[PDB]
mmCIF file of C-alpha atoms in Angstrom:
data_model
loop_
_atom_site.group_PDB
_atom_site.id
_atom_site.type_symbol
_atom_site.label_atom_id
_atom_site.label_comp_id
_atom_site.label_asym_id
_atom_site.label_seq_id
_atom_site.Cartn_x
_atom_site.Cartn_y
_atom_site.Cartn_z
ATOM 1 C CA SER N 36 0.004 -0.005 -0.004
ATOM 2 C CA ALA N 37 1.426 3.437 0.921
ATOM 3 C CA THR N 38 -1.317 6.121 0.840
ATOM 4 C CA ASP N 39 -3.860 3.347 0.075
ATOM 5 C CA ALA N 40 -2.058 2.306 3.252
ATOM 6 C CA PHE N 41 -3.021 5.428 5.239
ATOM 7 C CA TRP N 42 -6.722 5.277 4.158
ATOM 8 C CA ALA N 43 -6.887 1.612 5.140
ATOM 9 C CA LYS N 44 -6.012 2.618 8.667
ATOM 10 C CA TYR N 45 -7.734 5.983 8.535
ATOM 11 C CA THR N 46 -10.934 4.493 7.276
ATOM 12 C CA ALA N 47 -10.973 1.707 9.868
ATOM 13 C CA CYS N 48 -10.450 4.293 12.616
ATOM 14 C CA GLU N 49 -12.673 7.162 11.393
ATOM 15 C CA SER N 50 -15.021 6.893 14.405
ATOM 16 C CA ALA N 51 -12.375 6.618 17.266
ATOM 17 C CA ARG N 52 -10.036 9.296 15.797
ATOM 18 C CA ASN N 53 -10.259 12.737 17.449
ATOM 19 C CA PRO N 54 -8.645 12.419 20.851
ATOM 20 C CA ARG N 55 -5.222 10.844 20.439
ATOM 21 C CA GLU N 56 -6.131 8.327 23.175
ATOM 22 C CA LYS N 57 -9.198 7.180 21.338
ATOM 23 C CA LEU N 58 -7.363 7.071 17.986
ATOM 24 C CA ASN N 59 -4.123 5.216 18.936
ATOM 25 C CA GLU N 60 -5.903 2.517 20.861
ATOM 26 C CA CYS N 61 -7.654 1.836 17.459
ATOM 27 C CA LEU N 62 -4.423 1.620 15.424
ATOM 28 C CA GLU N 63 -3.221 -0.317 18.448
ATOM 29 C CA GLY N 64 -4.966 -3.595 17.364
ATOM 30 C CA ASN N 65 -6.700 -4.700 20.562
ATOM 31 C CA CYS N 66 -10.366 -3.720 20.518
ATOM 32 C CA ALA N 67 -12.949 -3.340 17.741
ATOM 33 C CA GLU N 68 -14.126 0.025 16.425
ATOM 34 C CA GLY N 69 -17.689 -0.435 15.006
ATOM 35 C CA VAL N 70 -17.668 -3.597 12.711
ATOM 36 C CA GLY N 71 -13.907 -4.486 13.574
ATOM 37 C CA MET N 72 -11.538 -3.396 10.649
ATOM 38 C CA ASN N 73 -9.269 -2.005 13.394
ATOM 39 C CA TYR N 74 -8.272 -5.268 15.095
ATOM 40 C CA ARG N 75 -4.889 -6.887 15.412
ATOM 41 C CA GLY N 76 -5.947 -8.708 18.492
ATOM 42 C CA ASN N 77 -5.093 -12.200 19.517
ATOM 43 C CA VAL N 78 -8.367 -14.200 19.726
ATOM 44 C CA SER N 79 -8.282 -17.632 18.212
ATOM 45 C CA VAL N 80 -11.765 -19.002 19.158
ATOM 46 C CA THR N 81 -15.299 -18.219 17.996
ATOM 47 C CA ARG N 82 -17.931 -16.856 20.233
ATOM 48 C CA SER N 83 -19.206 -20.434 20.488
ATOM 49 C CA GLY N 84 -16.126 -22.148 21.850
ATOM 50 C CA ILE N 85 -14.747 -23.349 18.486
ATOM 51 C CA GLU N 86 -11.079 -23.100 17.537
ATOM 52 C CA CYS N 87 -10.370 -20.946 14.541
ATOM 53 C CA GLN N 88 -8.622 -22.647 11.647
ATOM 54 C CA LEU N 89 -5.317 -21.289 10.156
ATOM 55 C CA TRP N 90 -5.749 -18.582 7.469
ATOM 56 C CA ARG N 91 -3.374 -20.524 5.258
ATOM 57 C CA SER N 92 -4.463 -23.783 6.733
ATOM 58 C CA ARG N 93 -6.835 -24.510 3.897
ATOM 59 C CA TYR N 94 -8.780 -27.687 5.133
ATOM 60 C CA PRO N 95 -11.685 -28.189 6.515
ATOM 61 C CA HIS N 96 -12.679 -25.066 4.686
ATOM 62 C CA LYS N 97 -11.116 -23.476 1.625
ATOM 63 C CA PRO N 98 -11.178 -19.673 2.305
ATOM 64 C CA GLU N 99 -12.096 -17.212 -0.499
ATOM 65 C CA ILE N 100 -10.494 -14.658 1.833
ATOM 66 C CA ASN N 101 -6.730 -15.267 1.987
ATOM 67 C CA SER N 102 -3.808 -13.021 2.898
ATOM 68 C CA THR N 103 -3.294 -13.333 -0.795
ATOM 69 C CA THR N 104 -6.156 -10.901 -1.664
ATOM 70 C CA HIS N 105 -6.450 -8.972 1.545
ATOM 71 C CA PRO N 106 -3.032 -7.458 1.526
ATOM 72 C CA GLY N 107 -4.843 -5.276 3.909
ATOM 73 C CA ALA N 108 -6.071 -7.429 6.703
ATOM 74 C CA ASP N 109 -3.507 -9.142 9.030
ATOM 75 C CA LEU N 110 -4.457 -12.731 8.095
ATOM 76 C CA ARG N 111 -1.951 -13.922 10.599
ATOM 77 C CA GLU N 112 -2.262 -17.616 11.468
ATOM 78 C CA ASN N 113 -5.755 -18.267 12.871
ATOM 79 C CA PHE N 114 -6.455 -15.055 14.850
ATOM 80 C CA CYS N 115 -9.775 -13.224 14.467
ATOM 81 C CA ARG N 116 -9.960 -10.786 11.640
ATOM 82 C CA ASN N 117 -12.507 -8.813 9.564
ATOM 83 C CA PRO N 118 -10.979 -8.413 6.082
ATOM 84 C CA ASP N 119 -14.488 -7.934 4.391
ATOM 85 C CA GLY N 120 -16.462 -5.351 6.472
ATOM 86 C CA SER N 121 -18.955 -7.654 8.184
ATOM 87 C CA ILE N 122 -21.718 -6.157 10.323
ATOM 88 C CA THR N 123 -21.321 -9.021 12.863
ATOM 89 C CA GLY N 124 -17.573 -8.405 13.456
ATOM 90 C CA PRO N 125 -14.004 -9.853 13.445
ATOM 91 C CA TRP N 126 -14.703 -13.442 12.551
ATOM 92 C CA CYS N 127 -12.692 -16.576 11.677
ATOM 93 C CA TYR N 128 -13.079 -19.876 9.719
ATOM 94 C CA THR N 129 -13.962 -22.595 12.190
ATOM 95 C CA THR N 130 -12.204 -25.962 12.580
ATOM 96 C CA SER N 131 -15.544 -27.686 13.043
ATOM 97 C CA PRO N 132 -16.319 -29.094 9.555
ATOM 98 C CA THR N 133 -19.923 -27.853 9.671
ATOM 99 C CA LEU N 134 -19.068 -24.238 10.595
ATOM 100 C CA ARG N 135 -17.309 -22.465 7.769
ATOM 101 C CA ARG N 136 -17.211 -19.234 9.682
ATOM 102 C CA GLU N 137 -18.218 -17.520 12.872
ATOM 103 C CA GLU N 138 -17.587 -14.225 14.528
ATOM 104 C CA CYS N 139 -15.426 -13.746 17.667
ATOM 105 C CA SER N 140 -16.122 -12.024 20.933
ATOM 106 C CA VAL N 141 -13.660 -9.186 21.247
ATOM 107 C CA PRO N 142 -13.176 -6.216 23.422
ATOM 108 C CA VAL N 143 -14.868 -3.027 21.945
ATOM 109 C CA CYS N 144 -12.541 0.041 22.087
ATOM 110 C CA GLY N 145 -13.431 2.529 24.871
ATOM 111 C CA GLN N 146 -16.969 1.456 26.008
ATOM 112 C CA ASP N 147 -15.742 -1.996 26.988
ATOM 113 C CA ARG N 148 -18.142 -4.717 26.308
ATOM 114 C CA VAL N 149 -18.150 -7.496 23.804
ATOM 115 C CA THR N 150 -18.633 -7.370 20.100
ATOM 116 C CA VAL N 151 -21.098 -10.284 20.197
ATOM 117 C CA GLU N 152 -22.246 -12.482 23.029
ATOM 118 C CA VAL N 153 -20.491 -15.797 23.625
ATOM 119 C CA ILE N 154 -22.508 -18.938 23.467
ATOM 120 C CA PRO N 155 -22.785 -21.022 26.641
ATOM 121 C CA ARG N 156 -20.856 -24.279 26.948
#
């Protein structure tokens, strides 16, 4: 990227961007800013208890999204991402053969809560 590079980040952090606290936190990948483009977390499981598959690991599911199309997105071994712009949030491809994909529960930035509720045992 470069300046496509600055927009990528700028876009993703347009809402948390005024106060430097609010805006760094965002670039600091750790919590989700609206649907979670800003997110360089560390959460390897879906909201239901399932273990995310590797981004390059391409079995049980073959991903259309691949770090080889989403220069963008940090499709770093099996963490939870949001390379598309999903309403539900940073998601991941499950390792359960009948669950292609599911979102992940992640810390929101600022008003701490959870992106989506985690399913009980």
